From a paper:
DNA Gyrase, a Type II topoisomerase, relaxes the positive helical turns by introducing negative supercoil in the DNA and prevents the overwinding of the genome. Functionally, DNA Gyrase exists as a hetero-tetramer composed of two subunits, GyraseA and GyraseB, as an A2B2 complex. GyraseA is composed of two domains, a 59kDa N-terminal domain which possesses the breakage and religation activity, and a 37kDa C-terminal domain responsible for DNA binding activity. The essential functional role of GyrA-CTD β-pinwheel fold is to wrap DNA and present G-segment for enzymatic action.
We determined the first crystal structure of GyrA-CTD from S. Typhi (StGyrA-CTD) at 2.4 Å resolution. The crystal of StGyrA-CTD (residues 530–840) diffracted upto 2.4 Å resolution and belongs to the tetragonal space group P41212 with unit cell dimensions a = b = 79.15, c = 87.36 Å. The StGyrA-CTD structure was solved by molecular replacement method using the E.coli GyrA-CTD (PDB ID 1ZI016) as a template. StGyrA-CTD adopts the β-propeller fold comprising six repeated subdomains referred to as ‘blades’ to form a β-pinwheel structure. Each blade of the pinwheel constitutes a four-stranded antiparallel β-sheet structure (A, B, C, D) linked by a 15 residue extended loop. The GyrA box region from residues 560 to 574 is an extended β2-β3 loop which could not be resolved due to poor electron density map signifying that this region is completely disordered. The electrostatic surface potential of StGyrA-CTD revealed that the positively charged residues are distributed uniformly around the perimeter of the β-pinwheel across all blades. The basic charge on the protein surface is largely contributed by the arginine and lysine residues present on the extended β2-β3 loops of all blades. This indicates that the DNA wraps around the perimeter of the StGyrA-CTD β-pinwheel structure during G-segment presentation. The sequence alignment of the individual blades depicted that the distribution and position of the charged amino acid residues in each blade in StGyrA-CTD is significantly conserved. It was observed that arginine residues, R556 (blade), R612 (blade), R667 (blade), R716 (blade), R766 (blade), and R817 (blade) could be identified as the potential DNA binding site in each blade.
Numbering used by the authors: 536 to 560, 575 to 839
């Protein structure tokens, strides 16, 4: 079973809705989740903290309705955004939480290490100044990990390469980042869906997942897309199936939805095609799979 849909918007309004009613009848859905009313959600923030919430503590609101600001439900600091929401019925055994920071560190902790909530939240990974927790997902012990950087680099390695650490551990380096570069996306590749990447000035592309070679961790990585001044930096990458849609938002509030099947499937050593035509000082700031 899975009863309701949890949504967290780009502006930080959170709500839930029974999914039957969610199926029937600016701001975009930044995280979507499916769970029971009495499931727990682990809310991981950009500051590297973790909060526990019962789904029923969220507002039940219709799909037109706005929801409640999550800053009013969690003890969030200034500019502390929710970067992951993970649903847990039972802290399933043999399942890992994998985390990735902008500075290229990664961390793997068993799900069960989070079975004891603290209402003030905990530190899920200690961060330095300016470093951010940019990705969290669940792995099974036998998954691969892909880290995507702003400069068009990607590293792909088996999750075995990261020793399962304790809840307090500081984490190891997942990718070697040159100079200004930062990790922007984490992907646990599953299935045959292609990798879609988009840049700041609206270029992007699909590349078959099997064309991303499995390297070792803590290397410099290979190229995922050629980043130029025309291109702009990589904003994000997601795995999509051919019937999926993506949504992109610029810092000018322009929202574009696009069916993935219309985006060309090319190699890693390209600049991409235009997915959204940005103005001169407009930059893509958000990518999300629908």
């Amino acid at each position: 079973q899975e009863d309701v849909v949890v949504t967290l918007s780009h502006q930080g309004y959170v709500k839930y809705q029974p999914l039957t009613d969610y199926e029937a009848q600016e701001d975009f859905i930044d995280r979507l989740l499916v769970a029971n009313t009495h499931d727990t959600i682990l809310c991981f923030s950009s500051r590297g903290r973790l909060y526990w919430m019962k789904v029923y503590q969220l507002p039940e609101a219709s799909r037109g309705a706005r929801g409640r600001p999550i800053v009013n439900l969690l003890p969030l600091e200034a500019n502390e955004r929710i970067t992951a929401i993970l649903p847990v019925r039972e802290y399933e055994e043999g399942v890992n939480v994998f985390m990735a920071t902008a500075s290229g560190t990664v961390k793997k902790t068993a799900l069960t290490e989070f079975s004891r909530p603290r209402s003030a939240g905990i530190i899920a990974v200690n961060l330095n100044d300016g470093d951010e927790l940019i990705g969290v997902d669940l792995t099974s012990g036998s998954d691969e990990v892909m880290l995507f950087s702003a400069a068009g680099k990607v590293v792909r390695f088996k999750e075995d390469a990261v020793r399962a650490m304790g809840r307090t551990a500081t984490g190891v380096r997942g990718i070697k980042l040159a100079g200004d570069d930062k990790v922007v996306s984490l992907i646990i590749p599953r299935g045959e869906g292609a990798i879609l990447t988009v840049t700041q000035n609206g270029y992007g592309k699909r590349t078959a997942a099997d064309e991303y070679p499995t390297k070792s961790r803590a290397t410099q990585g290979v190229i995922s897309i050629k980043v130029t001044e025309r291109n702009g930096s990589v904003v994000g990458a997601v795995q999509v199936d051919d019937c999926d849609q993506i949504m992109m938002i610029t810092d000018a509030g322009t929202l574009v939805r696009t069916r993935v099947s219309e985006i060309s499937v090319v190699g890693r050593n390209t600049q991409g095609v235009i997915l959204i035509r940005t103005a001169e000082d407009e930059n893509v700031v958000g990518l999300q799979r629908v």
